[PDB]
Amino acid sequence: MRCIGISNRDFVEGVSGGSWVDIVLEHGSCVTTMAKNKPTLDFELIKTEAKQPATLRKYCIEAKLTNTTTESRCPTQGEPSLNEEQDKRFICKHSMVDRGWGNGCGLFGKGGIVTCAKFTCKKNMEGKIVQPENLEYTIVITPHSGEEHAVGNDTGKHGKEIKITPQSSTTEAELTGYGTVTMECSPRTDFNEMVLLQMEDKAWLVHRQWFLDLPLPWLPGADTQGSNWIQKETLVTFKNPHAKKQDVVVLGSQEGAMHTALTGATEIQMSSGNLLFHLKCRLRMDKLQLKGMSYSMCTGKFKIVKEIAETQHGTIVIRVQYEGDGSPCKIPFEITDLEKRHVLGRLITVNPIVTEKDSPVNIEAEPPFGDSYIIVGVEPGQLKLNWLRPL
């Protein structure tokens, strides 16, 4: 009954008798499944998750150069040196400047220079290794049991949670009162050669080869030191145009640059390892059964707890409380023409039943286009509601 309220919803009906039905579950999408003399079920894909992914490589996208230090030598005085050359946190370059009398040298010539600066990463991006094997799916199956709260109940408590693993693709969940439903799901979108690149609160799924060939400073997955970066040269530039001085320049944030490069790519919503992303399944309904197909018809009177409300798909919802005594019993329900002669429209919440008089029931039905009578219960106290469904 979760689907009631969700705009991206499909009403999949299986050719009655058939022991299977094919559905496509995805994020932000709900599915309602029906079959003759079988219970109506609601399916949602709650979460997609990677179980322990290996950090392939971490790249620096924004850097900072500090501690700029220069050692020079007069012509003929040798090559200059700093310890920073040994220190891996620094990026160094040797060059030549014009030396002579007016800048401290007894001789006139090309005096050797050396400049070192501290490479500090400010923003970086991990790309975690995904294998289709360690990819888990979380499906919620909610039967149409009229349960008082069930209507668009986001919490989940009402439905049976199920995990689809590529190691355990076939799962048989026992639905309390309806029997078992075997679910056979197939992973679709390759994930073998795919890196799940994580930026900030933004993340995507990208090619292994594309990732690995980025012109940026990087660190191997294994590294948790985070001090000295491979390829600093990709963000650092040394300038000496007039042999007067050597200038060290940062290449500017690559954050927005990256977002633009990632336009064509598969964007995914991410939060604490979970990717809220086209998972195609087969449903075995042979082992499913209607709760109450052998219960007798309610004879009592019914009260209207929640007024008829129309869903975005033309369907209607009614919440009613039983005031009789026969419970557990089948609630009588009918949609007829104004002249109460023709049976019209269909019932989504098939075989509506009362379990307890105290607990109200929610019924979803598809009214016909135009005027109809929604008749819930039996005479006396028979509820005769009127509906309009314009074209």
Ligand X SMILES: *[C@@H]1O[C@H](CO[C@@H]2O[C@@H](C)[C@@H](O)[C@@H](O)[C@@H]2O)[C@@H](O[C@@H]2O[C@H](CO)[C@@H](O)[C@H](O)[C@H]2NC(C)=O)[C@H](O)[C@H]1NC(C)=O
Ligand Y SMILES: *[C@@H]1O[C@H](CO)[C@@H](O[C@@H]2O[C@H](CO)[C@@H](O)[C@H](O)[C@H]2NC(C)=O)[C@H](O)[C@H]1NC(C)=O
Rank residues 89 and 389 by Cβ distance to ligand Y and give the closer one.
89
84 binds, among ligand X, ligand Y, none (CB under 5 to 8 A by kind): none
Residues 48-77 that bind ligand Y (CB under 6 A): 66-67
Q: Quick one: tokens of 197?
A: 């690149």
Between CA 385 and CA 338 the distance in angstroms is 10
Q: Is 227 in the site for ligand Y (CB under 6 A)?
A: no
- 200 neighbors 298 (Cβ within 8 angstroms): no
Among residues 55, 153, 180, 321, which is the contact residue for ligand X, using CB under 6 A? 153
Q: Which of 365, 361, 362 is nearest to 315 (CA)?
A: 365
Q: Is 158 in the site for ligand X (CB under 6 A)?
A: yes
Between CA 266 and CA 257 the distance in angstroms is 17
153 binds, among ligand X, ligand Y, none (CB under 5 to 8 A by kind): ligand X
Among residues 51, 64, 122, 157, which is the contact residue for ligand X, using CB under 6 A? 157
67 binds, among ligand Y, ligand X, none (CB under 5 to 8 A by kind): ligand Y
Shortest distance in whole angstroms from residue 300 CB to ligand X: 22
Strand partners, 180: 174
160 binds, among ligand X, ligand Y, none (CB under 5 to 8 A by kind): none
Shortest distance in whole angstroms from residue 190 CB to ligand Y: 44
Query: Which one-letter DSSP state was computed for residue 325?
Result: S
Residues 117-136 that bind ligand Y (CB under 6 A): 118
Residues 332-351 that bind ligand Y (CB under 6 A): none
Q: How many residues bind ligand X (CB under 6 A)?
A: 7
Classify each residue of 221-230 as buried b or exposed e, where b means 16 or more C-beta atoms within 10 Å of its C-beta.
Answer: eeeeeeeebe
Residues 92-121 that bind ligand Y (CB under 6 A): 118
Between CA 320 and CA 305 the distance in angstroms is 5
Q: Residue 151: count other Cβ atoms within 10 Å of its Cβ.
A: 21
Q: How many residues bind ligand Y (CB under 6 A)?
A: 3
158 binds, among ligand X, ligand Y, none (CB under 5 to 8 A by kind): ligand X
Enumerate the H helices of 119-212 as residue ranges.
208-212
Torsion, Cα of 206, 209, 213, 216 (10° steps): 30
Which residue is it, tokens 């392939």? 56
Shortest distance in whole angstroms from residue 47 CB to ligand X: 19
Tell me the CA distances in angstroms from 147 to 288, 354, 386, one per residue in order: 18, 9, 24
Q: Is 155 in the site for ligand X (CB under 6 A)?
A: yes
Shortest distance in whole angstroms from residue 117 CB to ligand Y: 10
189 binds, among ligand Y, ligand X, none (CB under 5 to 8 A by kind): none
Q: What mask of x and - would describe binding to ligand X in positions 112 to 151, judged by CB under 6 A?
A: -----------------------------------xxx--
Shortest distance in whole angstroms from residue 6 CB to ligand X: 13
- Give the Cα-Cα-Cα angle 363, 365, 370 (nearest 5 degrees): 135
Q: Which of 3, 316, 27, 16 is nearest to 141 (CA)?
A: 3
Tell me the CA distances in angstroms from 287 to 112, 113, 186, 330, 350, one per residue in order: 85, 82, 21, 22, 17
Shortest distance in whole angstroms from residue 148 CB to ligand X: 6
Shortest distance in whole angstroms from residue 4 CB to ligand X: 10
Rank residues 155 and 209 by Cβ distance to ligand X and give the closer one.
155
126 binds, among ligand X, ligand Y, none (CB under 5 to 8 A by kind): none
What are the strands of the beta sheet with 370-376, ordered from one edge? 333-336, 370-376, 383-389
Shortest distance in whole angstroms from residue 290 CB to ligand X: 19
149 binds, among ligand Y, ligand X, none (CB under 5 to 8 A by kind): ligand X
Between CA 93 and CA 236 the distance in angstroms is 11
Shortest distance in whole angstroms from residue 219 CB to ligand Y: 18
Q: Quick one: tokens of 370?
A: 């135009």
Residues interacting with ligand X, by CB under 6 A?
A: 147-149, 153, 155, 157-158
Residues interacting with ligand Y, by CB under 6 A?
A: 66-67, 118
